[PDB]
Design a protein around this ligand. Sequence first.
Ligand SMILES: Cc1cc(Cn2ncn(-c3ccc(OC(F)(F)F)cc3)c2=O)cc(C)c1OC(C)(C)C(=O)O
Ligand SMILES: Cc1cc(Cn2ncn(-c3ccc(OC(F)(F)F)cc3)c2=O)cc(C)c1OC(C)(C)C(=O)O
Lengths: 269, 269
Amino acid sequence: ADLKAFSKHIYNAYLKNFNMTKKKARSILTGKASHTAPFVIHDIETLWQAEKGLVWKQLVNGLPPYKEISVHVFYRCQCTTVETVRELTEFAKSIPSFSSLFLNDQVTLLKYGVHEAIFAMLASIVNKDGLLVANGSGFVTREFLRSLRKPFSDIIEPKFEFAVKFNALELDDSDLALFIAAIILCGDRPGLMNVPRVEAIQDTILRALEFHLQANHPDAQYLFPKLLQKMADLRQLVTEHAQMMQRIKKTETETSLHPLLQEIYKDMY
Amino acid sequence: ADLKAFSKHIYNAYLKNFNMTKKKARSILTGKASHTAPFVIHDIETLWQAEKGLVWKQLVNGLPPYKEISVHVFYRCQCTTVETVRELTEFAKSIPSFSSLFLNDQVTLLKYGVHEAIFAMLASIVNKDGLLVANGSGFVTREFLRSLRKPFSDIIEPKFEFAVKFNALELDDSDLALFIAAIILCGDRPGLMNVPRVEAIQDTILRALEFHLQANHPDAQYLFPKLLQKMADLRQLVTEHAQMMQRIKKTETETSLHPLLQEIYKDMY
Ligand SMILES: Cc1cc(Cn2ncn(-c3ccc(OC(F)(F)F)cc3)c2=O)cc(C)c1OC(C)(C)C(=O)O
Ligand SMILES: Cc1cc(Cn2ncn(-c3ccc(OC(F)(F)F)cc3)c2=O)cc(C)c1OC(C)(C)C(=O)O
């Protein structure tokens, strides 16, 4: 009660804001709802094919001018990330009392949380071998992404490592809704004004998550503490990511960075 | 139709979000809605009377600990201003294409625009003699405010100086809606991401304003350039105000600043 309602409201916000759920993604990856697989990108040729219709169906990509394969893929990563951020902000608007914070605090929370949330949600569209892209019309292999030149392969691999370990907790969409809401409502964010309010909201979300997990996964007893540890793991994974991003900006000078990402990484830690 | 439609929608946002319009204020200040005037505050006694129900109807002031009349009035100033910031934020959300900017840009625009807008709208509740407070239930005299000790009287007087000259343009609420929308949609704000989008929106607002002025004030010809100059004046007024605010923080160590105002003033330019 109250937590059941809270959980359901968060879940519905999740379902309303994310086109690609873990449900849909698993359904595609196992082959039960499609009957014809997504287009597999695993090399230069198939990437080129995918960009002329098979996966992205426009005759000029509307991405920055690229001079090599690795940077092209990096730009694709930026596109996915930007649209996930967009969805995450819209999702945050439906969290109880998020919209009632100061606008500045909303911006702070999103700035410092979206990457943690993105890395958590990636596991829904990732398996050992690769990841879904373009709402599941494409599947990019992990071996291809490992084959990109340093430092871009270096940035991509850790997300696979984390996602594969995170998928072993076998959460479903209704768990993940509460998990990512709690990621966003973090009181530890630099420059937050109303820390106690945000901590109280996170308090509620996490109580609802504990409740929801005992209902949904009766036999997994220690699922809740591990998930809290997952949050801490995510923070460090983002720290490492940010370090590599710094190195990119230093050493890959005309690799362009989307303005939203320039803002997020601006002054970050 | 095009600019008439834009204008009217801005006007409706204005009418839906500001408790005190120039219409209401002039009706109260001239004595037409009154039959008996607002409670005049011009010294400590009337301030004490007003704070126990007559004007502010609470039995604990909920203001920070203050040790003098000047700081007490400064805190009242903060309260009025914070509520105006809240109203302006809601008003900006209803401006066409404001809500469509990145949240970072919305926050930047409000951060650097609210004081300019507040100083413009202050003229609606001011005459030579004082100003309305608490939705027109109170009237605080300018001579009382001059009687506060430096630096507080110093910060307040220039707003009167500006407002009295601004009231000589005989604008009405429907002009002011477009004027303050244009103040907020400033492309010149430090740290704006999408400058051209904001400048296009402001262009629309300003064209609508010129059109609306040609309809509403046919015979007052140089009104539009003068208003452009008013915007520049407001910028200079906010520079001076902010300088004085700095000297407050340097030299009035027992004076607290509301957190939202602390945010606006931290790192401003
Ligand atoms: C580098 C990065 C990766 C991820 C996850 N990720 N990993 C691979 N892809 C991917 C690969 C190929 C593709 O298509 C095609 F290229 F055609 F193969 C479409 C998408 C992802 O979305 C997440 C964040 C936050 C990243 O950091 C950035 C974006 C820089 C940032 O936030 O600034
Ligand atoms: C110091 C200042 C003044 C103004 C205008 N102004 N002048 C007087 N009042 C007022 C006076 C008396 C009253 O009631 C009673 F106290 F009882 F008399 C209630 C309201 C205003 O609102 C505007 C800004 C931005 C100010 O600067 C601050 C707030 C720090 C800031 O930076 O935001």
